[PDB]
Assembly symmetry: D2
Homo-oligomer: 91 residues x 4
């Protein structure tokens, strides 16, 4: 839908993952992030950024589905360099 | 050689890249970083971390050799998530 | 839809790419392949195979959209090792 | 050393892997292949081809070192699309 609202969803749920205790909290937070990226996926270049982000989130869901909470949390932190790469280029 | 001294080399040269103006400054700083990672490349796991870092630095040298200073600087910032992944795991 | 019919679509269109002359022939053939893989994307493991294939086809569409017919043809041949990896494992 | 002799080493040892029974046969064959690629690593482009091949062989050694003979054999077959990509371009 809206771009600013997609960024809010991504930024807010990333903290929910950082503060999560179990796999169900992580698995749900990533599902909202995946939906916000695919929704933003709509010069590009810019659009391929969101394609990369969808992939990384997707691989983190496997970890959460297997019960690997610690590694799912580790994988979510590596997303930040995709986030920053866009900002550093298109801002 | 020593591990603490390899980390100093990596951390100091990363800033030299951030503050660089031309390609020759970036190209030289990455060459010292590549040498410090390969030197540290000597459970692992831990050692594969340095293998990933060598690859990313290697691809950044192509950008600097082609005169792409801005993108070489962008590529150097993406290294940080490799740096942090080790620290978050083995510390 | 059906699995055997998805494999036919993939195998037939891959030859259409190999025999293609212009970008419009390649771009259209990849679009049918992408649809057949995403359709087959429905233990896994097995299912992640189709996720990898979707990504590789996706990157080949950029080449075809930029007019790079030769490289789009090169990228389509690298798909075959994904194809064979599944067969060698699950057959 | 010589290019034609490096290709012989790669092609011959690849079959030794395909016909291997235990991990020690696979682990040794990959070690000769890794040496032949790094030796050939000496426009490029062409040279980056050998850089990619070194990486893939390197990851296959982990599998062989962990006793995963079947997957090490699978990983060795995926090398062929790197082999063919060079030939299709520079021949
Ligand atoms: C990945 C995990 C993230 C996170 C957490 C954020 N982004 Fe982006 N972002 C992009 C652009 C062009 C802007 C500016 C336009 C706008 O204001 O929406 C932003 C902005 C943000 C914000 C600030 C929004 C605000 O309230 O003012 C935040 C918090 C934010 N981002 C977080 C562009 C991109 C990308 C382009 C390819 C990618 C990828 C990301 N952002 C990824 C992320
Ligand atoms: C990549 C670009 C980097 C950078 C800039 C740094 N590291 Fe590491 N690091 C690792 C470990 C186990 C330690 C603790 C042991 C030690 O003290 O040497 C560190 C420590 C550091 C420091 C602090 C050193 C000090 O003076 O006390 C700094 C500044 C530093 N690192 C920077 C382990 C790893 C890795 C393991 C796989 C990887 C990769 C990195 N570090 C990468 C980086
Ligand atoms: C990628 C480009 C390809 C291509 C060209 C093909 N495949 Fe597959 N495939 C898979 C399985 C389990 C089967 C057996 C089940 C079945 O018969 O459908 C196949 C079979 C085929 C065929 C033969 C179909 C027939 O008519 O009998 C062909 C021509 C074929 N494939 C082409 C499984 C997979 C995968 C699993 C992850 C992947 C990926 C692919 N195949 C990819 C490809
Ligand atoms: C990866 C696993 C492989 C394997 C098994 C082979 N290659 Fe290459 N190759 C390249 C070039 C330019 C040539 C022609 C020059 C020459 O004759 O040496 C070749 C040739 C071969 C041969 C034939 C050699 C002969 O006896 O005439 C064979 C058997 C062979 N290759 C196997 C270039 C490249 C690459 C460039 C980047 C890469 C990568 C590979 N080859 C990889 C492989
Ligand atoms: Ca806001
Ligand atoms: Ca809001
Ligand atoms: Ca808002
Ligand atoms: Ca909590
Ligand atoms: Ca992908
Ligand atoms: Ca110190
Ligand atoms: Ca010092
Ligand atoms: Ca010191
Ligand atoms: Ca300066
Ligand atoms: Ca059939
Ligand atoms: Ca049919
Ligand atoms: Ca049929
Ligand atoms: Ca034709
Ligand atoms: Ca010969
Ligand atoms: Ca010989
Ligand atoms: Ca010879
Ligand atoms: Ca045998
Ligand atoms: Ca590598
Ligand atoms: Zn894209
Ligand atoms: Zn980890
Ligand atoms: Zn390694
Ligand atoms: Zn950039
Ligand atoms: Zn998957
Ligand atoms: Zn090519
Ligand atoms: Zn290279
Ligand atoms: Zn396998």
């Amino acid at each position: 839908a809206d771009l600013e609202d997609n960024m809010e969803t991504l930024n807010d749920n990333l903290k929910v993952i950082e503060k999560a205790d179990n796999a169900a909290q992580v698995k749900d937070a990533l599902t909202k992030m995946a939906a916000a990226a695919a929704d933003a996926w709509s010069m590009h270049d810019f659009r391929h950024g969101f394609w990369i982000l969808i992939g990384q989130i997707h691989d983190a869901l496997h970890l959460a589905n297997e019960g690997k909470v610690k590694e799912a949390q580790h994988a979510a932190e590596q997303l930040k360099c995709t986030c920053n790469h866009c900002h550093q280029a298109y801002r």
